[PDB]
Amino acid sequence: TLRAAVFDLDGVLALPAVFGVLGRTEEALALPRGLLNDAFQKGGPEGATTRLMKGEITLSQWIPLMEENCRKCSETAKVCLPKNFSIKEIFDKAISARKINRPMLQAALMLRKKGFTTAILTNTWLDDRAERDGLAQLMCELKMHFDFLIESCQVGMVKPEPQIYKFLLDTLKASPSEVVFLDDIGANLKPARDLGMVTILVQDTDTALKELEKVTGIQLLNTPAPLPTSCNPSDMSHGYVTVKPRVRLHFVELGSGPAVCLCHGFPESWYSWRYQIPALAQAGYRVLAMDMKGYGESSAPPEIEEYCMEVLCKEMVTFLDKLGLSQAVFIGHDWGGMLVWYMALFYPERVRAVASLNTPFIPANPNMSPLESKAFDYQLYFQEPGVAEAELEQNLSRTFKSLFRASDESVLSMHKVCEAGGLFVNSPEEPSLSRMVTEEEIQFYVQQFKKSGFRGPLNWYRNMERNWKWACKSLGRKILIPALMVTAEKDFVLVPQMSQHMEDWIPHLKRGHIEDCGHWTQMDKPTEVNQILIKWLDSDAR
Amino acid sequence: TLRAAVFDLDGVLALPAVFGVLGRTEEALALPRGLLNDAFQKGGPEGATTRLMKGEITLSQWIPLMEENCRKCSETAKVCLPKNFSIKEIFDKAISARKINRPMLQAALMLRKKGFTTAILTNTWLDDRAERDGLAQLMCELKMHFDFLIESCQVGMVKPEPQIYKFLLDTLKASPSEVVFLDDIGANLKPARDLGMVTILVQDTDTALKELEKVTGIQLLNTPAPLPTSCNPSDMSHGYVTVKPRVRLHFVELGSGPAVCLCHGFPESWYSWRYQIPALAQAGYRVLAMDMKGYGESSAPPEIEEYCMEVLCKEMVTFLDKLGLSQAVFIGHDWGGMLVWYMALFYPERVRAVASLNTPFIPANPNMSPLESKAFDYQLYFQEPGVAEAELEQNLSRTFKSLFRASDESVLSMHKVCEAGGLFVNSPEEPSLSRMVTEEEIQFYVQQFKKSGFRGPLNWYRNMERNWKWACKSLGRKILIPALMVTAEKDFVLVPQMSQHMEDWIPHLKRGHIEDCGHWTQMDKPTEVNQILIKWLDSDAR
Ligand SMILES: FC(F)(F)Sc1ccc(Nc2ncnc3ccccc23)cc1
Ligand SMILES: FC(F)(F)Sc1ccc(Nc2ncnc3ccccc23)cc1
């Protein structure tokens, strides 16, 4: 019975194999078969390559020691090497062209979700080339998905020496019979076999995965499309910025590159971006997922006037100021989307690009008050301080389970809430668990709302007149910075139709649409949200 | 009697003035004198420029409204405009060439340090150009140095309307006679004069500063070179990352660009980089100033083995991992410098570049143990757990005041500490305040050391044998990534002479030296530390 899975990097989790490139180069340069592979493994355990794999020497130290081993191997073959020949050049392209073997990672991901202890076991070197980052980036992406990463140059042992295999077992804290090992090299496979481990020779991913699903008894091949990588809250970098004496803002930060500021809606968290954070950071962006004023680990002042658009926006500018950021791309959902359009209209120099999910940009009516624009029953229900708070705070588990659901799961009514006297009047006390959320994921929102409740979040609805008077100062402006509007087909609050005239105020407005998507866009359709944002960020946000 | 200073931006805090460019363009393009300035102020308070300055319209909306005002102004002059004429092009270079007027900022800085309430009052626009960032960056740099920033396009009022002047007074909470106002335009100066404010017409910075120092009674012109901008701890963005179950790391983060990880020494704080943080962030870098393991807001496990180089380095790699950073440039001082050389030798793919202050890279002697390499009396004094802790924790104010001092202030003895039985045996109970530190700055270190004391910091000294055995695995390697060694002339612990053979292991090693500089490099010689690091970062770290 198995509980551990071990993968090699070269030829198993990463394709094409770097080793195979030594052969291709001989075939392309019409060099005697094996010339470069003879120079590679020259001296065996006493040779330059073993010293490199054990961490005795770095990659840049090995490069000449390989070139002179290419000089010794050609003397035996009598032929001479070309003019534009560079060992560095061959390895640079070889390492560069090597990309993650997505199906192999998917299988590793699936095994780990089924309670397997996963690990990478590779014969690698200490990379000190000018272009070492590409590989550091690759290793970063892979490693997060595994329990352990055993690099030969770190452990000082190497494959096929049996010491690394006993080290593998001691690390995994498991009996060899509880271990599946996968390698593309028979030699590096034999010692695992001898110890009593299940071994899979990798020649093609499909057969290798067949052998894996055969022995594990878990579906790994042909399995449905997996959800994007999520966030474990405790494994994140949490940031805190005091924007003013009583007001502190919290964010979760991930990645390098242009600053991408994510603004959640009502009643949410930075956690509502759980599937976007790893994805956007992987796309080469510095993700700053906010806890908006009144939410989670951010300050929740009681006063209503503390949550009008002007103060909220001015506070987000101070956030940039204190973090040392002249600009950030502002991506907002729901009330976050509203904030994000005001950031663009009042502080365009602070906004690199602006993106909204479901929330349209609707210019204020200077004649009619927003309390009339009745023309949203829950809005009126939220006006009275204390009422909605008491209902939403009554049972937190119930509140989120009732709210957080797909279009095909709808259990909540937005119509005639006031006359019936409650948001959950015609709702079960123990609602069913939605297909978008796990019990654990709902508990995160429960834990966060236990800090300061719904007063702060609900105050975002209690500044209609202030927001209206303020927005009226922007009636002569146009949003001319890069902008994206993302509509969700089945959002019955923020309907796609409401966005139709947006090009009248944003001429260069780019668009995105998601079919069969509810209000809770990010958790409903994550893969497509990420696809839309990455494509727009790469084209309009640098 | 004055207590408030008000500066304009264009022509006062920023030179050359954008307004003057309208004249230069006429003079360069041989256009009828004033043509572009007539088109600029066309329509007066009902014109496009006033609408722009009040925030009714953005800069990109105004650009055509100015081009057609250049078409109307040329009909009256009868001449026609050239082919390669662009209003956007003129303003782009105009805004770009406008840089901070350093002496004017220095004077504002000096007034604020003398207890003045400082403010910027400018007639500006909402900038939505593709190149708006340059100006956003400029505004960011200036604003941090002032109590208030009143932008016309934000307040909806403009100069010379008297409403903005009464708004200025209400903001400052001061009587007009307690206010010095400075502008390069007589018109925008008159309403301040009428209200009873001190006014200074700016035509040349020197005369303007003479008038300022005359009326304020404070030396502003010819004054000594000021210290670089420091950090107010509460105004910083504080980051927290759990690197393992019991271990959490804290850092202060500022700026955008390549990640620069700052590693302090013993017995220090992220605060030891107070003068480098704003400077390096201003140079286009993402500063991550660490609280090393055992210090400040970071976890301080009691066990000695928790502070050996291998665990400390492996933990800094997890920090990169959890933050989503494939690489960072590692700048270390004292024990931080040591860490930083091991980061380069064991994880070169994670290090963009490596820099050390005072700490040389000395390869371990594989024959002789480090306990012999006696050939550092305080080292032996730190070996016994509890002894040094009790002395250093006895009076925290005394401990830092005795330690943190310049070469010309030396009161502490490193020689014969063990036989005398104490670090502060021949030291006063109430030491004098060093020229490098303020009483407040010493209290910050006192407050931080009150959390977990000296056990954690002192354990960095208690792993000699482990560090030695580990370092011996790197004896075959060379540091081939960009590297900088910065020696401090008067450091009697980490002497410049000790660095002499460093090129034997780091051939491409770049160097920096600071004359008349003690051990506490960063606070001793900040301006020169920043000068050296920025110059090396810009050339070797991208
Ligand atoms: F009401 C609940 F919480 F039960 S579901 C729900 C219902 C509505 C919204 N968003 C907005 N509502 C009203 N004006 C807005 C204006 C701008 C953006 C969002 C909104 C969120 C959740
Ligand atoms: F000792 C005090 F704290 F009183 S002054 C003082 C004295 C010495 C150091 N640095 C180092 N000491 C010993 N080995 C090292 C090895 C590497 C780096 C620094 C060191 C710091 C402060």
Q: Which of A519, A227, A481, A531 is nearest to A357 (CA)?
A: A519
**A184 has binding-site annotation:** yes
- Quick one: DSSP state of residue B45? G
State the nearest Cα–Cα gap between B140 and chain A, in angstroms.
7
- Residues 6+ away with beta carbon under 8 Å from B399: B267, B392, B393, B424, B449
Distance of residue B450 Cα from the nearest chain A Cα, in angstroms: 22
Atom of ligand 2 nearest to the CA of B266: 21
A366, with CB counted inside 10 A (0-12, 13-18, 19+), is exposed
Please name which of B183, B185, B186, B154 lies closest in space to residue B171, comparing C-alpha atoms. B154
Between CA B334 and CA B404 the distance in angstroms is: 14
As a whole number of angstroms, the longest Cα–Cα distance in chain A is 96
Atom 10 of ligand 2: nearest residue by CA position: B334
What domains appear along chain A, each with residue ranges and CATH number? Answer: 1-16+97-217 (3.40.50.1000), 17-96 (1.10.150.240), 236-542 (3.40.50.1820)
Residue B284 burial (10 A CB sphere; 0-12, 13-18, 19+): middle
User: Which is the closest atom of ligand 2 to the Cα of B423?
Assistant: 4
Distance between CA atoms of residues A37 and A23, nearest Å: 7
Resolution stated for this PDB structure, in Å: 2.6
Residue showing tokens 């309390």: A371
Rounded to whole angstroms, the Cα distance separating B363 from B224 reads 43
Query: Of the listed B38, B445, B461, B524, which one is catalytic?
Result: B461
3-state secondary structure B158-197: CCCCHHHHHHHHHHHCCCHHHEEEEECCCCCCHHHHHHCC
Sorted by sequence, the CB contacts under 8 Å of residue A521 that are 6+ apart come out as A333, A357, A358, A486, A488, A491, A514, A529
**Residue A277 CB neighbour total at 10 angstroms:** 28
Q: Provide the angle, in degrees to the nearest 10, between the axes of the packed helices B102-113 and B205-216.
A: 10
Write out the catalytic residue numbers of A: 334, 461, 519
What sign has the CA pseudo-torsion B315, B317, B321, B325? positive
Of B281, B322, B346, the CB nearest to A235: B322
DSSP letter at B137 equals H
DSSP structure class, residue A119: E
B334 is catalytic: yes
DSSP E strands in B78-224: the ranges are 99-100, 117-122, 148-151, 179-183, 198-201
CB B35 within 8 A of CB B26: yes
C-alpha atoms less than 13 angstroms from C-alpha of A218 in its C-beta half-sphere: 19
Cα–Cα distance for residue pair A244/A318, rounded to 1 Å: 8
From ligand 1's centre to the CA of A393, what distance in Å?
Answer: 17
Q: Are A487 and A496 in contact (CB under 8 A)?
A: yes
Which helix (H) or strand (E) covers residue B529, if one does?
helix B526-540
Experimental method: X-ray
Q: Are A139 and A116 in contact (CB under 8 A)?
A: no
Pick from B132, B255, B259: CB nearest A324: B255
b/e burial code for range A143-155 (CB count within 10 A of at least 16 → b): eebbeebbbbbbb
Helix (H, G, I), strand (E, B) or coil at B242: strand
